[PDB]
Design brief:
Belongs to the cyclic nucleotide phosphodiesterase family. PDE4 subfamily. The protein is built from 16 helices and no strands. It is an all-alpha fold. The chain is globular and about 55 Å long. The structure holds the ligand COc1ccc(C2=NN(C3CCCCCC3)C(=O)[C@@H]3CC=CC[C@H]23)cc1C#CC(N)=O, magnesium ion and zinc ion.
């Protein structure tokens, strides 16, 4: 009430002490912040990594842009909302400080990875690309049916810099901006699951040929490799829910299932084929999660864990324990 925080902001601040740890209580932060998890977590991270001084970002501009970006995630969407954005941001933030990547990435690469995490699902309508395509939506027309959502996410994330007092990149040189931008685009476009197999194939190829001079940190000596790692990093963060403590993981599963079932309901009532996993009448959440883990998340994370051996061991362990838990609850 002029000077010091309210009691609610103090509780927020104490939760925010876990910002560098896997399994931050992100839902509690959403509650405590007045549904501003993305704004507060991004601001804490930016401070912690000293990104405001390094890139000469005025603080009011950062807050303004963050609030604006957060306002363009849909509160009526159960999974692909600002809490998910905040979790992928915070998850990418943890992955960036992994010991095997110490001093590997520049401040600009770190910025790109964080900013990309923040915008990666903005303005998500809670239905899939295929749904947008099959309905003939304007978004699908604009993007020629190709990575419709992910293209839209980028375009919105950047467009919003143009609102009043929102250009957080106003003090970067053109050279910094062009490089930031290319990285952010490459990162976000790689979040489309249709790219998953190729991304995973290339990450394996990198783990086969991996080099490691001086300390024990990875050697990445060209753009193609540096960007791959960043892309896989944010892709791991995006696919991190099953690696979190179970209480968190289940909240995410509840939410994704609600969103998917909602789409299935829209699909039914319109007489469309029901998309896989979206039919509330023919669901096994437990089988589905075990298959997601076995076909998608475990192969990716096991490969990530090889790249940065042994830094991801506890994350892989938690994933395997969660997978057993779900396997044991199968009817
Ligand atoms: C915590 O659970 C989940 C969390 C996330 C996802 C995601 N799936 N996919 C696709 C869906 C179609 C099959 C092809 C692979 C995965 C997405 O495109 C989403 C958007 C971006 C990345 C991954 C997202 C699924 C589940 C689940 C499940 C369950 N049926 O139990
Ligand atoms: Mg997405
Ligand atoms: Zn996402």
């Amino acid at each position: 009430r002029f000077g010091v925080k309210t009691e609610q902001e103090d509780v927020l601040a104490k939760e925010l002490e876990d910002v560098n740890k896997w399994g931050l209580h992100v839902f509690r932060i959403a509650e405590l912040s007045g549904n501003r998890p993305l704004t507060v977590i991004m601001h804490t991270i930016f401070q912690e990594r000293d990104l405001l001084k390094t890139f000469k970002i005025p603080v009011d501009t950062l807050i303004t842009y963050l609030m604006t970006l957060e306002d363009h995630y849909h509160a009526d969407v159960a999974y692909h909302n600002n809490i998910h954005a905040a979790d992928v941001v915070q998850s990418t933030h943890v992955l960036l400080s992994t010991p095997a990547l110490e001093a590997v990435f520049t401040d600009l690469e770190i910025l790109a990875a964080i900013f990309a995490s923040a915008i990666h699902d903005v303005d998500h309508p809670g239905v899939s690309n295929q749904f947008l395509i099959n309905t003939n939506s304007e978004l699908a027309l604009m993007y020629n049916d190709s990575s419709v959502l992910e293209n839209h996410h980028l375009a919105v994330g950047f467009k919003l810099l143009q609102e009043e007092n929102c250009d957080i990149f106003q003090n970067l040189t053109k050279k910094q901006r062009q490089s930031l931008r290319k990285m952010v685009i490459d990162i976000v476009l790689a979040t489309d699951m249709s790219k998953h197999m190729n991304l995973l194939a290339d990450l394996k190829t990198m783990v086969e040929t991996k080099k490691v001079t001086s300390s024990g940190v990875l050697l990445l000596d060209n753009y193609s490799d540096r960007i791959q790692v960043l892309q896989n990093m944010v892709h791991c963060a995006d696919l991190s829910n099953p690696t979190k403590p179970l209480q968190l993981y289940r909240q995410w599963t509840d939410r994704i299932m609600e969103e998917f079932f909602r789409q299935g309901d829209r699909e039914r009532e319109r007489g469309m084929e029901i998309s896989p996993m979206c039919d509330k009448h023919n669901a096994s959440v437990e089988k589905s999660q075990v298959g997601f883990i076995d076909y998608i998340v475990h192969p990716l994370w096991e490969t990530w864990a090889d790249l940065v051996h042994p830094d991801a061991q506890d994350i892989l362990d938690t994933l395997e324990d969660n997978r057993e838990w779900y396997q044991s609850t199968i009817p």
